[PDB]
Structures are given as C-alpha cells and as structure tokens.
From Swiss-Prot:
Subcellular location(s) per record: Periplasm
GO cellular component, one term: membrane
Entry's Gene Ontology molecular function annotations: oligopeptide binding; peptide transmembrane transporter activity
Name the UniProt record assigns to this protein: Periplasmic oligopeptide-binding protein OppA
Role summary: Part of the ABC transporter complex OppABCDF involved in the uptake of oligopeptides. Plays an important nutritional role. Binds peptides containing from two to five amino acid residues. Displays a preference for tripeptides and tetrapeptides over dipeptides and pentapeptides, for peptides composed of L-amino acids and for positively charged peptides. Cannot bind the cell wall peptide L-Ala-D-Gly-gamma-meso-diaminopimelic acid.
Disulphide bridges, residue numbers: C271-C417
Keyword Disulfide bond: yes
Length: 517
C-alpha cells in the first residue's frame, strides 16, 4: 500500500468485504470464479501482479526477458518467501504449472496455460504425454524459462491469474485436499489463512514472511459469502461491512446514490452478462432454436432495470471496450424487437416448435436477488415474445458451477469476466477443447479462426480476426448476450486504496488501508 502524506491511519487496521458466495476451494488449481480469485490474490502470488491501473507489474518475478515473444525468461527476486520461511523458487513454478495441466488434477482452468501455448501442452492435456514434457524449466533456483510453441506477444498478461500462482508440493502431497486448512496451508502472498467457517466467513491475517510485507497496512481481512445483494447493502449500512460485493439491488441503487453519494463507486468492468445455452442438449443442438432464444430476448427491457448504473445492452460475448477489440454489431441488433420476434417464431416453427406444440425450458441460475428478478423477466419476455415456457431452477454457487460442466441444464444465467485484457481471454473459452467451455459449443470453423490469430503479422490483423470469431459465434447463436457489466459497489469513507480503475477489478488487500475515524 501507498498511504498519502497527511493521512492518519486508524489504530485498528481490519477490513470486512462481502465476496458474494461461498468459495469452491482455496486450491488455486481448483477454482474458476471471481469470488475464488479474490481470496486467492491475498494468499498466493504468481510471477506478476496487477498494479492499481490494471497493468502487469512485478510479482515473484522482479524482471523478465523475451526472444520473439516465444522464449520468456523470468528473474525471480531472491527474497520471495513462503509462509514457512522457505524460498519461493523456479522449481516451485515448474511443479505448479505441471500440476495445473495434469488430467489427474482435473482443473477447471487446465486450459489457461494453453491460451499461451506453452511447448508440449496440447498432448499433455489429452493425456498422451507426461507433465514433465511441459515447456517450462528452472535454469537455476531464481530463473524460470518458458518456451512457447509460437510467438504470443501477450503471454505475460496471463501471468497475473491465480491459476498460475505457485503452490506448495510438500503440503499438497502430505495432506491431499486438506492442504488448504488453517493448520496445513503454506502461502506466498500478503496474507495467510486464519479461519474458514463454511457459509460464514474466511479470515486472513497478514504474513510477515511476504517479501513486500513492509508495504502492507491491513492486518486482518474478513471475506463474507452473502449471495443476497439486499443483505449485503443492509449489513454495509448497519456498520458490519466495509465494502459490498460489486452487485447491487436493482430497486435500491438510486436511494443509495441519493443518500450516500460519495460511497457509491461505479467503474468500467470487462465482463458480459448472458444466458448460456447448452449447445449439446436438445433442442438446443438446433441452431434455429438457439437463434430464436437469442432474438426473442428484449435486451432494452432488461438494461432499463439497471440503467441508473449505466449498463449497455450486449450483442456479443467479448466486451466492445476490451483492449484490441473493434467489434461490429450484427444486423439483427438493429431491428425492432417485433421483427426479431417474428424472425424467431418462424425459426422455431421451421424446427417443429409451434404455438400448438410449444417449447418448455429450464432456466438455471445461482442464488442472488439480482439474477432472480432478471430470470423472472427473461422467462416472462420469452413467453410473450416467442411462446417458449421457461421454468426457474436455483442452485448454490458451487453446485451451479458443477451443473454447467456436467451439462445437466438447458439454459443458464451466466457471466464471464476477463482474466487478462485481451480478446482471447473471452474467445478461448469457446474453443472446442477448452476446460471452460460450459456452453458445450464446438465449431471447427470458430476454432480455425482462433488458430489464425497467432499466424498473423500485425496486431491490426489479429484485431480483425477477433471480429470474424465473434461474427461466427453469433451466426451459430452459441449464447444469448444480455448486457455488458459495470463494477458498482459501496465502499466506506475510511477505506483507502480502492481506485476502481482496473477494468478487471483485480484488487489486493495489501494495497488498502484504513483512515482514522
């Protein structure tokens, strides 16, 4: 943290944040959600970190080199330490990246290092080659060399994501899944774990072994799992919570801006809200059916519920404002909604679904006052607009996520947030082979476009090809885009060091501090 001159710190440096829901895991190879990453970023530290403006900055790596964006050398700082007092080494990295790609780990982010195309990775992920063939090596204890199979000029930007953090072999091998329990866990970041009360709180404590401990100010942070946006704001206003999660109650946002205007932050956020179609579940293996669901949704009715917050209606998957995106709007986006409806019912009818022989659908969503109102609207619009009956089904966050991977749903509420600020952070999740493809979308056409992006000579060419990919994704109606996100949350006037200026919102507790009050 960087506390400005003139500020008087409080004696008690503690922070309470709502994290939105109970985490999947504190194992960095066993997580895929925003809540998971948010705690992970306080516990473990990879080669690089996000600075206060979203940019990549030194982490364990103090400096780095690259040849043709294909061989990357990272020089690890000599004072990087585990909560053990033991050194964080290059071999820790080799071990951890290997583990991330082992089929036996079954990581939901197994594919993340494949987005950077480390040598040897495709066959390893399919189980045809051992993990020790991965193109990552420790030249010495403080020098990691990564060899990619082609040039990827943005490879470094991946390396801030928690799935790429190092993890402790010895703890993992002694304790199996219990390695992350308070007494067992060994950590790399500004904090370690003090307590974990399932469905109540995760409490972390400052670690004096952290190389940059001198700059840390907060001594204890508490993460809560409140899925109720209303309960979140309630317990903020009553004094318990210092920072709400970044999802607001639709009916209360304007009261809040009128009442505590200086505590309401709203910043750009590179995430997309959409209704994910299970492309492998009949009748949604039929492109005409997917297209009818997409066109029949009335995005302007939906965004008009959150218009105070400034959300823009979505026409694709990757956010238009992502770095390197210059997207086009498809022709359907310019129609009236009545013409979109007409088209949709013609398409349904062509597939065999008529007035008299109507489609009935299940809409899955994770517990949330926000998702529940928007699911009730979605189901009502779809009925009126295209004659599809939609029933609601709600699951807890951990179970929600698992269900989508298993395929046991028709359509679901969904949200993807960039892991790095580049369009492949979204587009790669729609690859046939991706551990994150919960769409179950498989298009050899899409895939081959994406391969082309790393054969081109210029960034402008790459940018043009991402717009082809999006177009192909939309022509296949892989998803129902609804709106682009905003990062809106409440933050107490005494909490310092939250700028809101990273559009991926990768904040760290080691950057905040509490002003005397």
């Amino acid at each position: 943290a960087d506390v400005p001159a003139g500020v008087t710190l409080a004696e008690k440096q503690t922070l309470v944040r709502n994290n939105g829901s109970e985490v999947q895991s504190l194992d960095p190879h066993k997580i895929e959600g925003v809540p998971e990453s948010n705690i992970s970023r306080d516990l473990f530290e990879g080669l690089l970190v996000s600075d206060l403006d979203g940019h990549p900055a030194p982490g364990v790596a103090e400096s780095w080199d690259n040849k043709d964006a294909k061989v990357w050398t990272f020089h690890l700082r000599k004072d990087a330490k585990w909560s053990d007092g033991t050194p964080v080494t290059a071999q820790d990295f080799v071990y951890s990246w290997q583990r991330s790609v082992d089929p036996n780990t079954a990581s939901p982010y197994a594919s993340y290092l494949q987005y950077g195309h480390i040598a040897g990775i495709d066959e390893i992920l399919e189980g045809k080659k051992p993990i020790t063939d991965l193109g990552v090596k420790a030249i010495d204890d403080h020098t990691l060399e990564v060899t990619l199979s082609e040039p990827v000029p943005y490879f470094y930007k991946l390396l801030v994501h928690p799935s790429t953090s190092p993890v402790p072999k010895a703890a993992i091998e002694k304790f199996g899944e219990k390695w992350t329990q308070p007494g067992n866990i060994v950590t790399n970041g500004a904090y370690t774990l003090k307590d974990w009360v399932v469905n109540e709180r995760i409490v972390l404590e400052r670690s004096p072994t952290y190389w940059n401990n001198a700059k840390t100010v907060i001594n204890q942070v508490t993460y809560l799992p409140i899925a109720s946006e209303v309960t979140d704001v309630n317990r903020y206003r009553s004094g318990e919570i210092d920072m709400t999660n970044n999802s607001m109650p639709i009916e209360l946002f304007q009261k809040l801006k009128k009442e505590i205007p200086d505590e309401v932050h709203v910043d750009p956020y590179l995430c997309t809200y959409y209704y994910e179609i299970n492309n492998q579940k009949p009748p949604f293996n039929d492109v005409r059916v997917r297209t009818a669901l997409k066109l029949g949704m009335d995005r302007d009715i939906i965004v008009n519920k959150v218009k105070a917050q400034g959300n823009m209606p979505a026409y694709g998957y990757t956010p238009p404002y992502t770095d390197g995106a210059k997207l086009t709007q498809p022709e359907w986006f310019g129609w009236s909604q009545e013409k979109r409806n007409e088209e949709a019912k013609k398409l349904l009818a062509e597939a065999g679904y008529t007035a008299d022989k109507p489609l009935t659908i299940n809409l899955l969503y994770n517990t949330s006052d926000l998702h529940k109102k928007l699911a009730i609207a979605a189901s009502s619009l779809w009925k009126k607009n295209i004659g599809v009956n939609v029933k609601l089904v709600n699951q807890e966050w951990k179970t929600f996520l698992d269900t989508r991977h298993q395929g046991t749903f028709d359509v679901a509420r969904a949200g993807w947030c960039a892991d790095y600020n580049e369009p492949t952070s979204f587009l790669n999740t729609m690859l046939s082979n991706s551990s994150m493809n919960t769409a179950h979308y498989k298009s050899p056409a899409f895939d081959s476009i994406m391969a082309e992006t790393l054969k081109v000579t210029d960034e402008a060419q790459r940018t043009a090809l991402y717009t082809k990919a999006e177009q192909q994704l939309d022509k296949d109606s892989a998803i129902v885009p609804v709106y682009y996100y905003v990062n809106a949350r409440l933050v107490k006037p005494w909490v310092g060091g939250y700028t809101g200026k990273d559009p991926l919102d990768n904040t760290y507790t080691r950057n905040m501090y509490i002003v005397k009050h």
